[PDB]
């Protein structure tokens, strides 16, 4: 778990860019890597930044395990122009806006072993059928326009993203780096390792069911209601 003391989210998110690359070069240099991000658009940007700081190392296109001639059949199917580039160097990304064919392609390229790194929107943590060796979660908050504030990733989500580093067929280990805010550091240190408690919410969301159940005559009177409870 990597604590960052910058509260202002843009600055924080930006200043964890370099650590992402380093987290790869450290924990999983040659093995598949998935990076989860707070924003639909952030996926592009982070794929780019991974490539631009990839140049720094004096090491270019280290995440591409096949020649450019092989990727051409796959790239013919693309609309997004930047995705072509990011894929050309071995990265690529997945998000809401991508055509299902584009997504299927990227997934194929990753699992087959052609591209070593994929940056993915957070929303795709649940429905993603392609696993990895190292998983790097970048900045566990997201933005909500309704109250105009950032709000933390639901814990089960985080656990799911973490579980996305599993490769039982081959690897003897699997790795995860979670870069988060100062505040949110201790919480993860406590609750990712221990088994989780789970509590009921029915007390709050209650009316709809009593109504529906009364309709079926499963609750005919107040007593039946307590019994149902």
């Amino acid at each position: 778990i990597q604590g960052f003391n910058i509260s202002h989210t843009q600055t924080r998110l930006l200043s964890m860019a370099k650590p992402v690359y380093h987290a790869i070069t450290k924990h999983s240099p040659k093995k598949p890597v998935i990076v989860f991000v707070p924003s639909r658009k952030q996926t592009r940007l982070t794929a780019i930044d991974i490539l631009t700081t990839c140049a720094a190392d004096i090491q270019r296109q280290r995440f591409l395990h096949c020649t450019e001639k092989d990727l051409i059949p796959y790239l013919e199917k693309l609309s997004d122009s930047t995705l072509k580039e990011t894929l050309l160097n071995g990265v690529g990304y997945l998000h809401e806006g991508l055509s299902p064919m584009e997504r299927r392609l990227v997934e194929q390229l990753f699992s087959s072993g052609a591209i070593q790194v994929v940056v993915a929107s957070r929303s795709l943590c649940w429905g993603m059928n392609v696993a990895a060796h190292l998983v790097i979660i970048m900045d566990t908050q997201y933005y909500n326009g309704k109250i105009h504030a950032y709000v933390d990733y639901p814990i089960y989500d985080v656990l799911q993203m973490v579980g996305h580093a599993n490769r039982p067929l081959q690897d003897d280990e699997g790795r995860c780096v979670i870069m988060c805010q100062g505040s949110k550091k201790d919480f993860f240190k406590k609750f990712l390792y221990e088994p989780l408690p789970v509590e009921s919410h029915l007390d709050h969301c209650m009316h709809d069911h009593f109504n529906a159940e009364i309709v079926t005559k499963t609750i005919e009177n107040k007593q039946d209601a307590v019994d149902y409870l």
Partner: protein, 871 residues
């Protein structure tokens, strides 16, 4: 070794050598070379040049490369050549790079950074730049911002002006990293500051900028401006200026008003006789110009601005009324001008009836402008002043005279000759562009430094880097930003320094014998040796954990705090070893006093008389220490906070130094001690921070932080003791009834409700026997005014344990302008421990605001913890 100019001669008198050089001869206009009017240069840029019909010769020389190329620039031209308007064009190009047909200069594409060496200069520059560029409607402002309140403010700001230092801290924190990649242009103005002790900063800026561009592949224009000095090609190499198309050099002959230089060095060893000799040289030199002409005296003292005057006066009276009649007659030349302006704030009332007056920031605010008006219109031919007059609003003088060249440096603990840029600026004020034929200037100095001041004002002087002194601090901050992981990246970084090209092209000077230079041509092994010692220094003071084997650095929070506050690595380790949870205020001050930044401050015999009085008039006992530097610094800080005036000048300057550095120092203390979690001391330290910022103790009424308030009213409410939070219960009438000043009743009320107030609720539920969940609901209770609270208001929320001893958790909560009155919901978890305690406390406190706090006991008296969970 130095050089004559052409017609120059040495004539030595008793006790002083006097050197004379004549004015330079302007280079004859080249074949078919004309000035450029404001017509024949591109359509858009022409706007905002109004009032000015023609371009200056040099401006006209390089305008082409200015607006037609992204190639980097270096110009070396003498003071007075008007360098700004060159750089201005380099800006008007970028301002033009983003333009539309149906809208002009759409401003979210680009931002420009103008780095100027002096504060007054920055102020006045934003002042005039605003007016000028306003035709475009582009918003230009000074960056004085504290980081967090004004970021989102300067978000919408373009072409931001700042001192190199400001840019460096603000980049170390990352306030810049939200701005950058929107930056296509940075201006380094007066880049010859490379030679100053401040030099390493400019070196750190530019090095970072270049080293960064190599990673991003996105480039930036860099425009350097310098006084005319050798080592121009070295500064060129540093700025990555292609010497072919990018380099520009002009010698001292291009000063718009030719300068006849007079330098009198004094041979007298005894200072007691010297303080006569220089007086007399002043008198003779001033009587030389006592006819129709204008003199300006730059003294480096505050008070001596008027001590130098009245000496000239009493001398002219002792002259049997000779030297007087500074006019063409009795009534002629407007002596009624000098007489009818009579009543003024300063001591001017004595000097004004006669021919001369004084100017400086201290005595008045508006009457400085009222004196500047008087000098421009030539009603006063003798004006004695300070360097801030040369650095501030621009007015020249027919002939200027620099008295003594030596100043008092509280940073150095002693006296030292003033900086390069100070003379260059104040002597570059010599002669008018309009009303003058040629300017002269007279530097009265010590003979020993007489060689030096010649190597400057004629281009003999090398520009060298002071980088080595600061190398350990520079390296840290780069590790802190993550721009250097290991030794290799460190040598790569240092390879971008000015000190690198200087170590390359003059190894003899920088400590490299030529043979071992041949043995290592690239300086790989010297740059590896260099930085290795910095690495060791940072390791020994615990800024970095770096093992020799890997060559890798690891940052520590202490290191980050150090970088972020621009505090040296000796001071920070002093704090590491000294700071303990149990420190009283009594001791906190001492630890502050032990800051390595103050190492040279000492206590003088003469002032130990006043320090004792001050020592007994301070609220926080120093008495742990006797008279030694610790005591002086301590009693000084207290004096500043307690707002006490000091008789000695030495102490005043000293105090100023101490208090200015104190903000960063105390703050780094707070940050450290907070990261540790030690509740009591983080309170004592943030409160100290506020007390320094606001210049008052907490025991004084919070209403004082609103400067809008009358002093007598404040003192009146302090007279009767009526606890401040009890003002909210009272209406507009009930307020005035306390102090029996009912006419004030409304206005007071406004402020009481302007004072930031949060009310807070909490919903607490246990999660496991170890941890509880807390939902804190912050509801703003105060009336927002952006002319008081501004764009943002900052608060620390921290939950403290049973004894208010340990801080179990803390967040930085920031309520923006828009959202006052909107309740914010913060959710966080806290641990509980085996002797389940009676309660926690949830504290919320404004960062900057003093006496502004709300505490919320969270009681566990009824808490029922969950059943422990089976294996």
């Amino acid at each position: 070794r130095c050089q004559l100019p052409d017609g120059s001669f040495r004539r030595q008198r008793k006790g002083y050598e006097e050197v004379h050089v004549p004015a330079l001869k302007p280079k004859p206009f080249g074949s078919e070379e004309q000035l450029l009017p404001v017509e024949k240069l591109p359509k858009y840029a022409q706007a905002g040049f109004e009032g000015f019909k023609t371009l200056n010769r040099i401006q006209s020389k390089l305008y082409r490369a200015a607006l037609e190329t992204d190639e980097n620039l270096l110009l070396c031209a003498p003071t007075g050549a008007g360098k700004t308007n060159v750089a201005l064009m380099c800006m008007l190009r970028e301002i033009g790079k983003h333009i539309n047909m149906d809208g002009t200069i759409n401003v979210d594409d680009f931002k420009i950074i103008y780095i100027a060496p002096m504060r007054s200069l920055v102020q006045e520059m934003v002042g005039s730049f605003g007016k000028r560029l306003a035709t475009y409607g582009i918003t230009v402002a000074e960056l004085t911002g504290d980081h967090q309140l004004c970021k989102e403010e300067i978000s919408a700001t373009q072409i931001i002006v700042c001192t190199p230092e400001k840019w460096d801290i603000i980049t170390r924190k990352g306030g810049e990293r939200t701005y950058t990649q929107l930056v296509r242009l940075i201006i380094l103005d007066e880049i010859h500051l490379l030679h100053d002790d401040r030099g390493p900063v400019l070196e750190a800026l530019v090095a970072r900028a270049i080293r960064n561009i190599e990673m991003t592949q996105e480039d930036v224009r860099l425009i350097g401006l310098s006084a005319t000095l050798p080592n121009y090609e070295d500064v060129a190499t540093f700025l990555r200026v292609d010497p072919a198309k990018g380099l520009f050099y002009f010698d001292n002959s291009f000063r718009p008003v030719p300068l006849e230089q007079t330098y009198v060095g004094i041979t007298e060893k005894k200072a007691i006789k010297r303080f006569q000799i220089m007086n007399e040289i002043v008198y003779e030199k001033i009587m030389e110009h006592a006819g129709k002409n204008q003199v300006l005296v730059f003294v480096h003292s505050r008070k001596e601005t008027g001590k130098t005057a009245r000496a000239i006066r009493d001398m002219c009276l002792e002259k049997d009324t000779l030297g007087l009649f500074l006019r063409e007659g009795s009534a002629s030349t407007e002596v009624l001008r000098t007489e009818a302006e009579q009543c003024k704030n300063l001591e001017l009332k004595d000097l004004l009836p006669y021919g001369f007056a004084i100017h400086h920031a201290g005595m008045t605010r508006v009457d400085r402008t009222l004196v500047e008006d008087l000098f421009a219109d030539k009603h006063i031919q003798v004006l004695v002043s300070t360097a801030t007059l040369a650095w501030g609003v621009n007015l020249p003088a027919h002939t200027v005279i620099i008295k003594g060249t030596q100043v008092y440096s509280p940073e150095k603990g002693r006296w030292t000759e003033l900086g390069a840029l100070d003379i260059l600026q104040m002597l570059g004020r010599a002669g008018r562009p309009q009303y003058d034929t040629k300017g002269e200037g007279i530097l009265i100095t010590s003979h020993g430094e007489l060689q030096y001041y010649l190597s400057l004002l004629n281009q003999q002087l090398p520009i060298e880097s002071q980088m080595v002194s600061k190398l350990p601090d520079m390296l840290n901050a780069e590790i802190v930003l993550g721009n250097v992981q290991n030794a290799k990246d460190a040598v790569n970084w240092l390879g971008y320094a000015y000190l690198y090209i200087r170590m390359l092209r003059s190894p003899t000077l920088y400590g490299i014998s030529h043979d071992d230079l041949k043995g290592d041509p690239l300086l790989d092994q010297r740059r590896l040796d260099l930085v290795h010692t910095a690495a060791l220094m940072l390791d020994k003071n615990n800024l970095v954990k770096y093992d020799k084997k890997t060559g890798n650095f690891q940052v520590t929070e202490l290191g980050r705090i150090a970088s972020h506050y621009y505090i040296t690595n000796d001071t920070v380790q002093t704090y590491n070893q000294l700071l303990k949870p149990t420190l009283s205020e009594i001791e906190l001050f001492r630890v502050f006093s032990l800051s390595s930044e103050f190492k040279n401050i000492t206590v003088r015999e003469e002032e130990k008389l006043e320090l004792q009085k001050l020592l007994e008039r301070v609220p926080i006992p120093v008495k742990e220490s006797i008279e030694e530097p610790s005591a002086k610094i301590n009693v000084l800080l207290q004096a500043f906070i307690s707002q006490l005036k000091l008789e000695g000048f030495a102490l005043m300057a000293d105090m100023v130094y101490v208090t200015q550095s104190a903000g960063r120092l105390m703050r780094a203390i707070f940050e450290i001690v907070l990261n540790r979690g030690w509740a009591q001391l983080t309170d004592k330290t943030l409160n100290l921070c506020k007390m320094i910022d606001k210049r008052m103790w907490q025991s004084m009424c919070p209403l004082r932080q609103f400067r809008k308030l009358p002093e007598e009213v404040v003192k009146k409410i302090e007279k009767k003791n009526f606890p401040f939070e009890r003002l909210y219960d009272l209406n507009h009438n009930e307020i005035g009834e306390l102090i029996r000043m009912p006419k004030m009743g409304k206005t007071i009320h406004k402020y009481v409700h302007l004072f930031p107030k949060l009310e807070l609720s909490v919903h607490l539920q246990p999660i496991t026997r170890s941890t509880l969940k807390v939902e804190l609901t912050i509801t703003p209770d105060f009336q927002w005014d952006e002319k008081v609270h501004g764009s943002s208001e900052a608060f620390w929320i921290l939950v403290e344990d049973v004894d208010s001893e340990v801080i179990l958790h803390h967040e930085y909560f920031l309520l923006k302008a828009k959202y006052a009155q909107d309740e914010h919901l913060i959710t966080f978890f806290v641990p509980v421990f085996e002797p389940l305690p009676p309660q926690y406390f949830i504290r919320v406190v404004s960062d900057r605001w003093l006496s502004c706090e709300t505490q919320l006991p969270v009681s566990f008296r009824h808490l029922i913890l969950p059943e422990k969970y089976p294996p």
